[PDB]
Design a protein around this ligand. Structure first.
Ligand code: Y6E
Ligand code: Y6E
Ligand code: CL
Ligand code: CL
Ligand code: CL
Ligand code: CL
Lengths: 494, 494, 494, 494
């Protein structure tokens, strides 16, 4: 069932959100926000800069002070507020999915059934953890009583990408708030709108002021201000590996703030000759084409054993030739645009390198349409390991298919990258499934599927795809700071 | 009981340790190693540089390969090797304590009864964790079987300081090896000797070659090579906050390697009027003077309620006037030298700032002796919060004593620093002990004691005193990399 | 704020609840249900017996089968259903609190503000755990992949007491359902009504049929049928220690079903001479008098240091002389009746033993009123350790106050019982608070408070006060059954 | 390599062990101890009875008192003593393996390479846990500080079986001592000798007196005394399900002591048509024949898909026809005797029922030899589900092989028992391996192997095969008692 908004979407929230009130930019400047499917301007939004990040950090710092409502309320009540926020997003699901689709160039069907559902589910997951964050009592040597407090870290700067604006907003603020932190959020310049609507719901739910502050603006300005701020305790960033290196450097340069990074990938699939071929073709297809290829986990190197390689390529090409391009709000449309011009150019450039460097073009290979940043879905076969399309993250609807004959060699090829976000193994052999997944240097390894991500799982990269993990039990560790308290006593007993 | 070595100490191990064999420096260069209590040269050691770190990373990488002995042996056997290494250090305790004291300027009594005991105990603690590192099975949404592997990260560069060369060597390699990593260790330029002897014992114990590689040399050369290396997965550094910022920046600049930092402090004590005064005087005294003040946790700001301030100052001064300076090997000597000239100059300079800026000099305040980097134990009273001796880490035998009258104000003063390693609270009030320890922004808070550190406790800093934790259950997390494995199944059941 | 039901309470749900439908008793027999404050009959309820427990076990067994909706739905959805049930109880809070007060003889103010709030909060706590129940991956010796599943146990029989019918219903079904079990609940013969209303809400919330089955009836009949049933996997019982022994024996005799027991107590308080005297008097007063003394944790032995004993006794007596007895529905009433005649007789008998055995009667000591099972609030001083009122659980509004002079001796006296549910320590001394709480053989020890119980804490007895724990992280273990799965593989890697 | 004792074994330790000293029985009576391979008497041992269990409980109680050496020593030192005990057993491995083989009728090769190795490894595993047993700090509702202590329970009675006397002794005392308990051990009447030698090593290692007390004697006398004792806090029993029911009943009848039970089984294997047939034949063969079939996990129902059934039966029969019966000390001997006459008679009786009830006798079926309790290794094919040999635990070298054609049906057959200790699944299908292991009601499920047990894994039964788990992280829970400590504070902060 796909319900829709019956009235025209109205844009209301366009300002900076600090202390639960709406602020104009200190400068007074605004910046435009566009629809990627028509290239038209949707509205203007206050452009946050350093001076505005500064106001937001002071509010988050004040809300984090010992004795404050956010520090003294029951953990169970932090969880209650998060579950109420999820309820409010459920109530506004139609308008949120519409705004996300319109602003993000995201198929409305997916925005409604996947993004919004994942936002609600992840918030509810995080809410349940709030009063279950616990320290230890420890049998230290000597006559002492030792316990630990897993405290919130403090003020957390959180820089959100444009490919999944709502899901990634919730993946950031959910755990941070559950653990008792306060946050300064910087949504992507391309997609500030849905985060500002959620800010309106954070007010409605009753979060104390300054617990969540949202500062739209640009990366090199507001994002850099966060990463270099001397009173931000931790920065979490999701985006390119190139910016991730800059975030980590600025943290070292300023105040040694803690850093979590969720970065790009060049994630491989290994399809053994004994695999369920149709199952592997479909999971690897969606694994690389999902959201116009704009997933960091994109299955952008697909290695197929020689004896099924040609059959795999044909079936992949047939699947890719079935899309309907156009406005992601129209029912039946199955591929929307890329997010903006910068990404669009890099995709087309990489596609050209595939042609020149000798990859076999099976379908697609060019732009589409009169308006919008549309790229034809493209499949390359006979890709080799030193081609650009095999080394660089494309972030577009561009599939690479490679042949292998030796299992030892293909694992080394799969691992021969600086990336390491995810991988897939397709086989019917129990031993191969366990040993290959163990040997891949990747944060998530899927067996006989791809792209399966849920709130209960930790998620993050090996190597240059990331530092740290998000979600699951394990992800919640990086939103606490562990304090050891050791008390002298006359005599301990076990 | 204080047994001693009956024969003259002989220095044997002076070379670089890679793949369980002894290497000359690629350059062929050596550097001198001195005794800080006499300023004489003890021996020469091969000077590792980038080319030597390079050989060590390739050995650690090869030892980490899937299928290798270190990757395939039982976790219980990793633990067995660590317990055997502890046995071997116990066997060589006399010579190790002598070498540590001679090279490190460290009171032999402490070297034998505390450093060596802590090395043995921490190794035995870490050994017990090896086959108890576990992942999860997770009830993910949908028809999937999801488990996690807490794998070793890989090759870990570990830069060891000179104030506790053996303890910090073991605090680094213990957890790293227990979790299955391989390491490239860089001991301090001042104190390479005891780490090279332990390397000889790692060979004897039977660790596979390349699991532990030790490259003596200088910070700006070998240490920088580690921090910027493109095939080191994680760097752990203990030392100054200034170098810590450089380590973190170089990690961001190169390969986004994971970073753990244990840095300096300006740790405060708060002594309430109802405290056991003698107990507070003695714990705070040793808290700041231990190992000639060369502890990152040094209790270098001591705040005393006005009505007991003068009594606290007198009793502190009497305790400080009781030391016997000289060679740390002679029995009855109770204060050895500072480690080297650089540290010695910074201490004397800061002591001079105390005189000029108006602190009340109660005892000490100058150098001592014909030879050795000796500083008189010094006490300053009437210290105020913007003096240099109240803001900068001294790392010398220099005690600061301050008065307070308001508890709200003194907590803000205690927290008004970029440091945050530790703190102490001295009181008989149950509520004050809990609420004050909760409000201090410090990684370890001691109640009615100070400086109590043990293998069972996590240990690390808030703010610019550190990133991450070492030891305890929680410290072992930062030597694993979490992989999620998600398997498609026909139907799951709870 | 104390809102009330504006309309007369109507009783609707009076039948056995199996497979989400209402059943008459197999026999066709019903039993009466009374109001303890007027001794009048409120209604009749179907009397479940063995044949009815049998129907309920078969339904719970079928609902637990592999492939069933309850076994295959996402853990997150089990949690969702529990949070919806909490929402429904919130909606029906007025009628539930009224029915609980009317049926249970429970002060309406407490029923509304404490019992109902605790029901809602505990359900919400348990809901959060559902998709956070996890097993392990384990580095077993040899070439194997080993993981564990923390499965639900299966069909759990749950026998609920009459002193807190709703809270204890939720403390049982919350964790059991969160972990994926199915249940057969047997509410107290005295108080079946609120559990049957909740059953109506379990239907409304959408739990699959047979996941929760509720069989009202008598202990020796339906309760014994559960404890001896050959296809019930686990029994949880809260009630007297005498019945607890019978439950455990019948489990051994039949099918070795798992057993959790939450039983009575004779819990002690130790009030040191340095205690906040008013704080100790008030917490110990409510600790023994709460809900007409009908708490298993009742603070029924209060030991006071000699020098403050007389002052403690006077202040206690003044507090006890302030109650207003009567119908627990009338505002301003502060003490309702005992639950029934059996309990009423045992209370009066024990009160008489206090008079005869030489206790000093300070106030109360007899019955009250024309109707209802009312007991005057009673205080005994000069109680000695071999009196009946110091050894046997009274479960009535009867306070015992004892003198001590030696701390070693009073701890031995506190521990000299077969019970061990809880205890309290009142002191301003940090060391005494830690060492005394460590030395008491009791499941919960309160320091400078009493009776503080919350969903985040494990709760249960030492010794003959109980087996196992309920709630908290730790309580959830006893609603899982751990399965180890060990898979042969060609070669493992860490 | 199989080294042997060069000198005749001398029996020295034959008395009751209490408070680290050797006691004669209160009665003065002794009982004989036999060799099962020759039926000759090896020595006499003091016969412990109730009066002797009484002396042992008082010693264990005194050793558990608050302030005692065992209660106050560092947890790390409890671990140290356990690692030293493992060292001492390693030193005495030859004599211990000889005594175990001689007393137990156990193949010396297995006694040396498996039993003794498992004793040493399990002790070392348990030692590592000692200072890693931790409670929690908990964010309770309201202004309170709440922590938990995972205390030792207290005095634990431990009844050890005769099939693995040393391994099961260590599986019991290892975790109990690691957690800080004191124990009263009752080795099997048939095999007291190796436990008394270990007691001598517990003295040598330096355990405080009364921490371990060992009372040889008979089940209905000393074992019943333990199970009914009013001052034993917990009983752990391994043995038959029939005695397990009596242990659990006596616990309920006396003092509600905690109970852990490791009982028998009728564990099934399911061999799918796609299995590695040779691998399944060998693992299932050893799974049922190990230690003359005297394992509770014996794979005593083997279900094989029809199309490979005949091939499976032939290959099994060939493997069973390869044993050499005789004295388990002689090299090359591969099957020793059953433990005693009672077990020997039950085995032969059940074998006769197989003949009469219509099972196809493939080999064996009778006794062997002039002396010793020897049974020919026996294989039955065409076994059906209501035969005695398919329902009752045989505990002898008797293999049952069954045919199945329907997977749904064979899982129901596998689960159609009151037992539930373990099971095996043999297949090459990933989905079948996961779904079948999930659906089996068994505590350990092996995939493509059988009988793989190690210290890092929890181990125990579903249903009437057991209550609770031993070893692993999870097994250590049942040797602690959780105490919640809740402290009133003026204001909490997260
Ligand atoms: C949020 S909760 O669900 O955890 N729980 C909180 C506690 N509850 C109260 O109503 C309550 C309130 N005030 C008190 C004041 C003094 C006192 F001694 C007790 C109380 C109790 C109380 C405490 C323990 C019990 C048990 C026993 N035996 C475990 C049944 C029963 C009632 C029920 C709701
Ligand atoms: C390291 S350990 O301490 O964990 N443990 C490893 C297993 N042990 C073996 O000797 C062993 C060896 N080989 C086998 C081969 C096939 C087989 F079916 C069983 C075995 C067993 C084995 C397995 C289970 C049991 C129990 C039962 N019932 C739990 C008592 C007893 C013996 C003892 C030492
Ligand atoms: Cl911790
Ligand atoms: Cl995990
Ligand atoms: Cl587990
Ligand atoms: Cl706990």
């Amino acid at each position: 069932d796909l319900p829709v908004l019956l009235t025209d979407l109205k844009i209301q929230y366009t300002k900076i959100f600090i202390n639960n009130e709406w602020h104009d930019s200190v400068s007074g400047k605004k910046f435009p926000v566009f629809n990627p499917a028509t290239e038209e301007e949707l509205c203007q939004v206050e452009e946050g800069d350093k001076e505005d990040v500064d106001k937001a950090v002071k509010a988050a710092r004040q809300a984090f002070q010992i004795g404050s409502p956010w520090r003294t309320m029951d953990a169970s009540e932090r969880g209650r507020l998060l579950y109420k926020l999820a309820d409010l997003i459920e109530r506004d699901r139609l308008l949120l999915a519409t705004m996300e689709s319109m602003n993000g160039g995201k198929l409305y069907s997916n925005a409604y059934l996947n993004d919004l559902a994942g936002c609600i589910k992840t918030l509810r997951y995080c809410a349940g953890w709030a009063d279950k964050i616990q320290g230890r009592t420890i049998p230290i040597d000597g006559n002492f009583f030792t316990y630990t407090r897993h405290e919130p870290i403090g003020v957390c700067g959180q820089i959100i990408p444009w490919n999944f604006p709502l899901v990634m907003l919730i993946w950031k603020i959910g755990p941070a708030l559950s653990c008792g932190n306060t946050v300064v959020v910087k949504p992507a310049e391309q997609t500030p709108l849905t985060a500002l609507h959620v800010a309106s719901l954070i007010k409605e739910a009753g979060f104390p002021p300054g617990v969540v502050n949202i500062v739209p603006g640009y990366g090199p300005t507001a994002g850099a201000a966060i990463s270099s701020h001397m009173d931000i305790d931790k920065v979490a960033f999701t985006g390119s590996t190139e910016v991730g290196k800059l975030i980590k450097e600025a943290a070292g340069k300023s105040n040694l703030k803690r850093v979590t990074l969720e970065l790009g990938g060049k994630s491989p699939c290994i399809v053994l000759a004994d695999a369920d071929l149709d199952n592997a073709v479909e999971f690897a297809h969606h694994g690389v084409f999902y959201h116009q290829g704009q997933c960091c986990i994109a299955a952008s190197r697909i290695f197929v054993e020689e004896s099924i390689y040609d059959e795999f390529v044909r079936r992949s090409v047939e699947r890719a030739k079935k899309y309907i391009l156009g406005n992601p709000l129209t029912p039946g449309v199955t591929q929307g645009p890329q997010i903006d011009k910068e990404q669009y150019d890099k995709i087309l450039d990489l596609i050209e390198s595939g042609k020149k460097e000798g990859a076999k073009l099976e379908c697609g290979g060019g732009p589409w349409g009169n308006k919008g940043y549309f790229v034809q879905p493209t499949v390359f076969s006979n890709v080799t390991d030193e081609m650009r399309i095999a080394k660089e993250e494309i972030f577009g609807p561009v599939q690479q298919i490679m042949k292998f004959k030796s299992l030892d060699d293909v694992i080394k090829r799969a691992n021969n990258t600086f990336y390491g976000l995810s991988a897939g193994v397709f086989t019917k052999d129990i031993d191969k499934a366990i040993t290959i997944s163990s040997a891949l240097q990747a944060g998530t390894v899927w067996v006989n599927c791809y792209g399966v991500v849920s709130a209960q799982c930790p998620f993050g990269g090996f190597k240059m795809s990331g530092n740290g993990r998000e979600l699951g039990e394990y992800g919640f560790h990086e939103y606490t700071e562990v304090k050891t308290v050791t008390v002298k006593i006359s005599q301990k007993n076990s």
